[PDB]
Amino acid sequence: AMRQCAIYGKGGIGKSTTTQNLVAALAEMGKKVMIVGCDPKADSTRLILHSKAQNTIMEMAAEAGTVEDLELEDVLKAGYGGVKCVESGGPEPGVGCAGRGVITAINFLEEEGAYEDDLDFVFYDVLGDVVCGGWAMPIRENKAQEIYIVCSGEMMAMYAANNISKGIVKYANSGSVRLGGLICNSRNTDREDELIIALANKLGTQMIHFVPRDNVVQRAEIRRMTVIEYDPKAKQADEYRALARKVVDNKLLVIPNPITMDELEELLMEFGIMEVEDESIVGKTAEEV
Amino acid sequence: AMRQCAIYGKGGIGKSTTTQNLVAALAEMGKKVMIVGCDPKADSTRLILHSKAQNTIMEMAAEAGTVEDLELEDVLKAGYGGVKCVESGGPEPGVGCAGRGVITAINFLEEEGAYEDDLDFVFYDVLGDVVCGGWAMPIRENKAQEIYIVCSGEMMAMYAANNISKGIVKYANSGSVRLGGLICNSRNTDREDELIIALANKLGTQMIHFVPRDNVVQRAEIRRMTVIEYDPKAKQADEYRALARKVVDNKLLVIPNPITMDELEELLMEFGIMEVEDESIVGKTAEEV
Numbered sequence A, B: 001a002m003r004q005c006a007i008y009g010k011g012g013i014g015k016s017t018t019t020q021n022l023v024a025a026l027a028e029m030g031k032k033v034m035i036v037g038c039d040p041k042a043d044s045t046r047l048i049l050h051s052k053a054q055n056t057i058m059e060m061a062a063e064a065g066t067v068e069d070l071e072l073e074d075v076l077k078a079g080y081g082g083v084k085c086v087e088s089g090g091p092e093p094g095v096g097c098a099g100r101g102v103i104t105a106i107n108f109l110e111e112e113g114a115y116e117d118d119l120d121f122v123f124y125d126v127l128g129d130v131v132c133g134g135w136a137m138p139i140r141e142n143k144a145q146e147i148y149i150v151c152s153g154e155m156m157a158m159y160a161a162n163n164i165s166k167g168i169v170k171y172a173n174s175g176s177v178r179l180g181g182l183i184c185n186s187r188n189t190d191r192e193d194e195l196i197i198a199l200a201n202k203l204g205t206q207m208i209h210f211v212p213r214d215n216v217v218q219r220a221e222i223r224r225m226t227v228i229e230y231d232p233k234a235k236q237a238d239e240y241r242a243l244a245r246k247v248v249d250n251k252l253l254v255i256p257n258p259i260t261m262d263e264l265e266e267l268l269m270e271f272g273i274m275e276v277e278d279e280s281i282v283g284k285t286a287e288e289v
């Protein structure tokens, strides 16, 4: 039953709100789930807990002396729908790797009955604009079974997406690290979905869902909760549920193959995002061109 | 004469365009400068060179076998105004630290007559949203004399700015790492400058300059050059020159002192960016509230 799924993507796109709401929808349809948080903040777990900031492990690393002294309650709590939030908080900002802190955090959960439960899914909210060895270390482990990239039809959300997929390449042979799909969290740029679908199959995956930009998200988040439990009757709530439907029923999980930057550049030149740069004007001043 | 200055900031704000244009203005007023690039791309050096992508060191690390075999020409070139561009390119995406690659790149320049020249300034274009030990490693060295944070009146450009400053704290005692100023690269949100000035003195520095969002930047960058050499007669060109004026004449260089997230949250609640969240509605459903 238990599948270990990572929610990768550039910082800012929609990871935390998407994942918390997906899981809420998933939990509404009877699935037992755990949410793991890796952002250098407590925001990734928040909406389920209704807490301003959940207590991170890195934060309780010094506030216990030794990490070994902590329990399951003080580090992880289940809020709405019995879905278990836990935050890492890597790093202590300026010295050390973010991801090496993340890794020792799951290793805590690895030597306790956290994973070993009647659980179906575990979700790893984590960034990857730049996917360095540090931020690519649950893929070193086999914590990264199913990888889903939240992105949008914009240069760097997408550049990031291709680079998260460059990291599946490296560890693809040595373990079950797969790319499940692509989530397009809407910017509202016209034929955005289309662009993420072009890029989806350019990479070999599909764009499993297109999440809209509904303002109800904002109304639910000032009550520090998910849209799922704020108004289940909301249109976006069923959009979020729809995602969870495709997640559980997902059978397409491929090892991707990245594209060159020229291939990403021409893709955005096709869809009209990037400019039709004249090579005749490059390197020249305004009084001539 | 030689001051070693870093241009820190969140990914996307304006680092590459700001720095290349600052240096171009600086070089127009007779200063000999070197531009160092650390973004996982060649974009940070581009506009001076007019090249689509400059040849990075990490890229020529395998395309030479041993890093020791490379020269000053194949790794660094001077484009317009004799200002010397060099790109690192860290990392090989998925394994290893970005910043540890950056460090060994400057160490190349450290054992060649790159620094030791008739140079006045060196500029380190580098990110810091999350400032980890890896991305905080020219501050471990004394490559980070003068740190200038490009940001805007928005949650994470600013969150980042405070966190770059949290990293000056750590290495402040053990070397000359200072915070020179704050550059506000305009979003156009109304009283944005004001917000970066509030945050500037909340941190102890000043907001040395307010860079506008002029579309001429776009017209100069399709000719893959700086606005300085595209149209010197442009209004934004003098804005960029103005920055360089304050840079050289800068005397204010402090060790900052970060603020709590509540202090950043209330600052944005004062300036109207963040919401006036009702505590009476938190944790409750729509049919009641």
Ligand SMILES: Nc1ncnc2c1ncn2[C@@H]1O[C@H](COP(=O)(O)OP(=O)(O)O)[C@@H](O)[C@H]1O
Pocket: A009, A010, A011, A012, A013, A014, A015, A016, A017, A018, A043, A185, A186, A211, A212, A213, A214, A215, A217, A218, A221
């Ligand atoms: N589908 C959406 N519709 C509307 N707003 C959204 C949506 N997804 C995310 N957001 C907005 O983006 C903000 C930040 O999202 P988050 O997921 O926390 O970012 P990040 O990628 O860092 O984890 C949300 O709190 C909200 O302001």
Ligand SMILES: Nc1ncnc2c1ncn2[C@@H]1O[C@H](COP(=O)(O)OP(=O)(O)O)[C@@H](O)[C@H]1O
Pocket: B009, B010, B011, B012, B013, B014, B015, B016, B017, B018, B043, B185, B211, B212, B213, B214, B215, B217, B218, B221
């Ligand atoms: N002063 C400016 N006026 C207008 N656009 C700007 C300005 N500075 C930066 N930009 C825009 O921001 C884009 C990205 O800037 P860049 O400096 O490359 O970002 P980053 O902080 O990652 O290094 C620029 O190519 C341009 O689209």
Ligand code: SF4
Pocket: A096, A097, A098, A099, A100, A132, A133, A134, A135, B096, B097, B098, B099, B100, B132, B133, B134, B135
């Ligand atoms: S760049 Fe990556 S590997 Fe290097 S310190 Fe940062 S999180 Fe760790």
Ligand SMILES: [Mg+2]
Pocket: A012, A015, A016, A039, A043, A044
């Ligand atoms: Mg987040």
Ligand SMILES: [Mg+2]
Pocket: B012, B015, B016, B039, B043, B044
């Ligand atoms: Mg850049």
